[PDB]
């Protein structure tokens, strides 16, 4: 509905400015096995 | 013959070079519905193996308690580690109004009518210790006749 970005007033190039917003930002995933993969609970039990 | 609840089942763990060795504790009480109660606490790598080790550990390790018409003699306290535990005898048709682990212990002990309350921690293992601690020190009118050398209208 308009994204409210954390960059202030954009001055020149807006795409390069949003690239450096939390909007974009690497999304990494939890492994389900090996090396960061321990659950206490697990989704149901 | 005798009744046998399963209270709780944790998974516990132990770290090694490899990673984690998981293992299961179970916790059971047994009792003759009539003032005897053991609790046992098993461990094993499978869950039905562990309940079984507990049911065995409970049968041996099992103590007497003088009830009165299916309720307590007098209002008892009890404590083990974090768990404090107050129980109070009740009029007929209360039922066992009482917490988690408490409720198991009292049912198979053959208490029918109590007002319990667990303060402190409510760690299942330390509550069934605190509850049994309570019930075993609790003492009949016939025992105290003997102590003091009476047998009065206090009887």
């Amino acid at each position: 509905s308009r994204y409210q970005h954390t960059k202030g007033q954009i001055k020149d190039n807006a795409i390069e400015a949003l690239l450096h917003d939390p909007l974009f930002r690497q999304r990494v995933e939890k492994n389900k096995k090996g090396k960061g993969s321990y659950m206490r609970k697990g989704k149901h039990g | 013959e005798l009744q046998e609840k399963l209270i709780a089942v944790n998974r516990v763990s132990k770290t090694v070079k490899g990673g984690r060795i998981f293992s299961f504790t179970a916790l059971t009480v047994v009792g003759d519905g009539n003032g005897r109660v053991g609790f046992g606490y098993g461990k094993a790598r499978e869950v039905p193996a562990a309940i079984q080790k507990a049911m065995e550990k409970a049968r041996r390790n099992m103590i007497n308690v003088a009830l009165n018409n299916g309720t307590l003699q007098h209002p008892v306290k009890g404590v083990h580690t974090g768990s404090r535990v107050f129980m109070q005898p009740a009029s007929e048709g209360t039922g066992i109004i009482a917490g988690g682990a408490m409720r198991a212990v009292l049912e198979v002990a053959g208490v029918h009518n109590v007002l319990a309350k667990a303060y402190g921690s409510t760690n299942p293992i330390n509550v069934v210790r605190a509850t049994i601690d309570g019930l075993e020190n609790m003492n009949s009118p016939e025992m105290v006749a003997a102590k003091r050398g009476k047998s009065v209208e206090e009887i």
Binding site: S1, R2, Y3, Q4, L23 | -
Partner: protein, 123 residues
């Protein structure tokens, strides 16, 4: 904890602040959409969540979540707002009420319609 000490200074029942103080103990309030916008949540969640800033009848100007899939709020839509926390999403203590004043309800619900102000479909 000494009796005598409590006579001279008795126990303070520590008095609790409300989580929804813009309401002022009204169960809803009305206000006007200043401004409407998406924003990203806290970790670990990933999303764009729809919220409006909103000036209430008692002056307070506060931000407000908008539920459901899709909407048509904007500058100067008059809306009703209720309490209701949202976690993945910082500083947002009130929900907008859907299907009351200038938020129409959600298009094409069937389950849980009353939470989104949707009339029973004639069938």
């Amino acid at each position: 904890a000494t009796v005598n000490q409590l006579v001279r200074k008795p126990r303070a029942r520590k008095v609790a602040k409300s989580n929804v103080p813009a309401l002022e103990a009204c169960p809803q309030k009305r206000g006007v959409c200043t401004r409407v916008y998406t924003t990203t949540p806290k970790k670990p969640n990933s999303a764009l969540r729809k919220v409006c800033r909103v000036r209430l009848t008692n002056g307070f100007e506060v931000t407000s979540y908008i539920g459901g899939e899709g909407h048509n709020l904007q500058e100067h839509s008059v809306i009703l707002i209720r309490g209701g926390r949202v976690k993945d999403l910082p500083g947002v203590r009130y929900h907008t009420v859907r299907g009351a004043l200038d938020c129409s309800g959600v298009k094409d619900r069937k389950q849980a319609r009353s939470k989104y102000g949707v009339k029973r479909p004639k069938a």
